[PDB]
């Protein structure tokens, strides 16, 4: 098959390939990129989303989060504390500060070792979930603010705006700030652009193994699992690569550098950390292939106002011949995680 090793792939589009976003996503799926659950896309050298990052010092981070982490033997739970609002300027000064700055290191493996060794000490501040875009109005290629995929149907046909899902979010990171193991809301795709600063490292589990990771997590955290089946959607659970390896969960790792895109795929579990002060922009998107994942997604029961997207409009428009069955609860379709989105047909 295409990428039978399910290893994270990197792509280097020309400007002409880069211009149509949905089409290029269909292309990288025709190359098997989706099997890893994560892919890197390096934009053309000529392309920039913004001329300068030195005029954003006045941007407000309304709800910075201090990340407290408790655990041992590769298994941790992360607790957020909302701090008072601060500007990018203040944040940047705390991030580049000596008590929170990146430690000295040679190779990525050393930094990774220090991350997993020091995870629970000196809790950092994450500049997370900031509504906004650092793109300039005029940039029409891979603009995270408007990607023009079928996810837009939630807005255009239904008038529903879900912040960070069909709208962009900014993330100002510092060393050791983390994102816990999760798939996207409604098992959507996500896109992530690192605007500037130090790298972001990522771990990914192939969608075809996602259930193995869930059973693993349920084993380690039975109480959490008993309270909510989808408790990983709480984005509190950290699990080291050593534990993944010990229990035989296939995974891959990759480091994203400023100027690079990461794409996560439906039901791709991923987690990671920031190397130092940086800024990333992201949102969710969809393709036709997502619709079945959306229909099957297991959602958090226990919490108030979690993201729940009505699938009705999608089934109605793109699967009319299955709509009656689906409404009746009789749609028994089984997802094959290896298959590319239909749109890939012309490349295959």
């Amino acid at each position: 098959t295409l990428n039978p090793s399910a290893r994270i792939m990197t792509f280097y589009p020309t400007m002409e390939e880069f211009r149509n976003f949905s089409r290029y996503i269909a292309y990288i799926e025709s190359q098997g990129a989706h099997r890893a659950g994560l892919a890197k896309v390096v934009p053309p050298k000529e392309w920039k989303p913004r001329a300068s990052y030195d005029d954003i010092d006045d941007l407000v981070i309304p709800a910075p989060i201090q990340q407290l982490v408790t655990g041992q033997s590769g298994l941790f739970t992360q607790y957020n504390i909302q701090k008072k609002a601060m500007t990018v300027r203040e944040f940047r000064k705390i991030a580049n500060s000596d008590k929170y700055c990146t430690p000295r290191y040679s190779e990525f493996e050393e930094l990774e070792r220090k991350y997993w060794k020091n995870l629970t000490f000196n809790p950092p501040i994450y500049g997370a979930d900031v509504n906004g875009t650092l793109y300039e109005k005029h940039v029409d290629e891979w603009n995270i603010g408007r990607l023009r995929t079928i996810l837009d149907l939630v807005e255009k046909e239904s008038g529903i705006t879900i912040e960070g899902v069909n709208t962009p979010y900014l993330y100002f990171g510092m060393w050791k700030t983390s994102f816990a193991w999760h798939t996207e809301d409604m098992d959507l795709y996500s896109i992530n652009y690192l605007h500037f600063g130090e790298p972001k490292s990522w771990y990914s589990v192939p969608p075809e193994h996602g259930k193995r990771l869930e059973r693993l997590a349920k084993g380690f955290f039975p109480g959490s699992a008993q309270s909510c089946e989808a408790f990983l959607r709480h984005k509190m659970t950290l699990i080291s690569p050593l534990m993944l390896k010990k229990y035989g969960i296939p995974f891959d790792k990759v480091t994203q550098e400023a100027g690079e895109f990461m794409i996560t795929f439906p039901y791709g579990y991923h987690a990671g950390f920031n190397h130092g002060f940086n800024c990333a922009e992201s949102t969710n998107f969809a393709t036709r292939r997502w619709i079945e994942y959306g229909k099957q997604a297991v959602l958090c029961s226990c919490r108030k106002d979690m993201v729940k997207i009505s699938m009705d409009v999608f089934v109605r428009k793109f699967q009319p011949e299955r709509y009656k069955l689906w409404k009746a609860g009789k749609d028994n379709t089984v997802i094959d995680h290896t298959l590319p989105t239909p749109e890939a047909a012309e490349f295959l």
Partner: peptide, 4 residues
Amino acid sequence: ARKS
């Protein structure tokens, strides 16, 4: 409802 939003992302968190």
